[PDB]
Amino acid sequence: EKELIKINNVMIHKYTILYTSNCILDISFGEDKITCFNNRLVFLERGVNISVRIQKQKLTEKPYVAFRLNENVLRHLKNTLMIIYGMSCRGVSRKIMTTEVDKMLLNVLREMMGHHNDDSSFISALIYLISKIKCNDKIIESLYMSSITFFTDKVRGVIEKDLSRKWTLAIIADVFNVSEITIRKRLESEDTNFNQILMQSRMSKAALLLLENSYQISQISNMIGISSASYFIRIFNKHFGVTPKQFFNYFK
């Protein structure tokens, strides 16, 4: 295989926490850059766009461990911790943060991995994890910032109910009962456009499907409303700077 990879156009759709089990992680956020080694934790503010360069330690193994917080769970943390702590602008050091993982936490993380669909015990274990972190002040700010719902999210959340649907601005306009114009403007106010949001959401999904049981490219291509498997690989590659195959191989 190969131990280095570089991936672009990575929007963080949901607050993500990374533990660099097996890899050293260089994150290019805007004109800034940020580095995560080895046994360590990374907090990624919802809604950042990045490039990343990942160097593996062991090539038999998957470069890091990932926690995506769905919107329910993110809402629960935020409220919880804003009662427990509180609200004593934001760039770089406030969005992407790292911290050293002592053996205590390492095993807390192991427990958090076990907890697929047990959100009770997961939000619990996370509150505690965060209680063990220095400069958790900015994590909790970061969670506040990540809770804010934008119209973009409203759109995305609809789209994402079925990505394979053949979505058009015209359709979405209709979903909001608002003029086609309005949608494009509301998005522009939030510095995006529909077809972009659609690209993103598809390519995200595409990527998450690869990393699974796995399906074939046609399947996945179909699953995200793309016609040609050959064609999909093209857009995917242009988007992440890698083909679906390279990517699966690196991660699965």
Add this chain to the structure above:
Amino acid sequence: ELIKINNVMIHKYTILYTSNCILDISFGEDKITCFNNRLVFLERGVNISVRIQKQKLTEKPYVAFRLNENVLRHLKNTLMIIYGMRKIMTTEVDKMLLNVLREMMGHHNDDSSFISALIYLISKIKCNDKIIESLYMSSITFFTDKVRGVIEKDLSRKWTLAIIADVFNVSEITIRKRLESEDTNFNQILMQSRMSKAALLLLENSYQISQISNMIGISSASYFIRIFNKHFGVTPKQFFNYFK
């Protein structure tokens, strides 16, 4: 080594780790046993007897956590969030719990981080539903509660049912009857208010019983000691001997 201790009333939710003791709990006339190395979950407001057996004599038999006002107020909003929408319980401790316990002990006066350590621990115990429910129960505010606060304004002060009437600008009948609908009496509340302060003070400093007797508003030091032994089934002396 071994001691038997009676009529122990819990004002604020309590957990045990039986680090260095095997603990046999009489709740009602059921008797419950926690072997060495066990967690124990104790509804606020309960009255029990315990028989405590130390393994090593140079340690305190156990670790006890008693929860204050802020803490359980926060738990409620918070665990309500995390769960959403059966008095004494015991359970086994793995290495994970065991360490968290340690860290709980080290959050001397850290609200935020203890609250947090706690929430997680709860979530790691089977049938915690019951433990969370026990925490619901303990959050509810009663009249007995309001009284104790007022009694606690100053334990040494000369409380009579008559003076309490004065203090709430209400009849003495109101007082005793609101308690009777809660199936308790003023002197039991006053008993345990004083016996609480007393038992706690014994282990805190090595201050004289005279001082303590002053502190809880008892005129005779002789009088105190006999109330104590009749309450807890051991004298002030043996009790300090055991736990310190």
